[PDB]
Write an enzyme that holds these catalytic residues in place. Sequence first.
Site, short mmCIF file in Angstrom:
data_model
loop_
_atom_site.label_atom_id
_atom_site.label_comp_id
_atom_site.label_asym_id
_atom_site.label_seq_id
_atom_site.Cartn_x
_atom_site.Cartn_y
_atom_site.Cartn_z
N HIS A 13 43.31 40.52 40.50
CA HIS A 13 42.01 41.20 40.44
C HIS A 13 41.80 42.30 39.44
O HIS A 13 40.80 43.00 39.53
CB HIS A 13 41.66 41.76 41.84
CG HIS A 13 41.69 40.74 42.94
ND1 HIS A 13 40.73 39.77 43.10
CD2 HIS A 13 42.58 40.54 43.95
CE1 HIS A 13 41.01 39.02 44.15
NE2 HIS A 13 42.13 39.47 44.69
N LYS A 40 41.12 28.38 42.57
CA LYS A 40 40.54 29.33 43.54
C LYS A 40 39.01 29.16 43.46
O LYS A 40 38.44 29.13 42.37
CB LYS A 40 40.89 30.78 43.18
CG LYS A 40 41.27 31.62 44.40
CD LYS A 40 41.65 33.05 44.03
CE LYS A 40 41.98 33.89 45.27
NZ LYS A 40 40.80 34.65 45.78
N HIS A 114 44.54 44.19 48.75
CA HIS A 114 43.62 43.11 49.11
C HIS A 114 42.23 43.48 48.60
O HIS A 114 41.85 44.65 48.62
CB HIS A 114 43.57 42.93 50.63
CG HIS A 114 42.49 42.00 51.12
ND1 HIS A 114 42.59 40.63 51.03
CD2 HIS A 114 41.31 42.25 51.75
CE1 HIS A 114 41.53 40.07 51.58
NE2 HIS A 114 40.74 41.03 52.03
#
Length: 123
Positions: A13, A40, A114
């Site tokens: 990310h 993804k 996350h």
Amino acid sequence: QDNSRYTHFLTQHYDAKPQGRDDRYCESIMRRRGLTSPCKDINTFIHGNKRSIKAICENKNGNPHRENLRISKSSFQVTTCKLHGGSPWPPCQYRATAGFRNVVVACENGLPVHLDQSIFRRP
């Protein structure tokens, strides 16, 4: 001093300084970061200062959020890659959406590990 889940977070990310954030940027970065077997369905990259992203875990740039998350006070440049077509297998075609807003993460021992992708789904 490294925590595997944090560096994995950056891998999936984070992109410090991207160039053009178009469809082709997506297709190439997803491949480069190994997110294409299977493809993804959606993945967002945050651009900017790593320092600021880490600070979302203290109150300096974060607020508690929902059950166990944190939401940033500052806004970040982001790019969302959405899988196109209907196959989980490469070639993975991606459509890019550049955006600018705050982000939601989960922290652990002071580090993001996350990224909540739901706020980037535009159903």
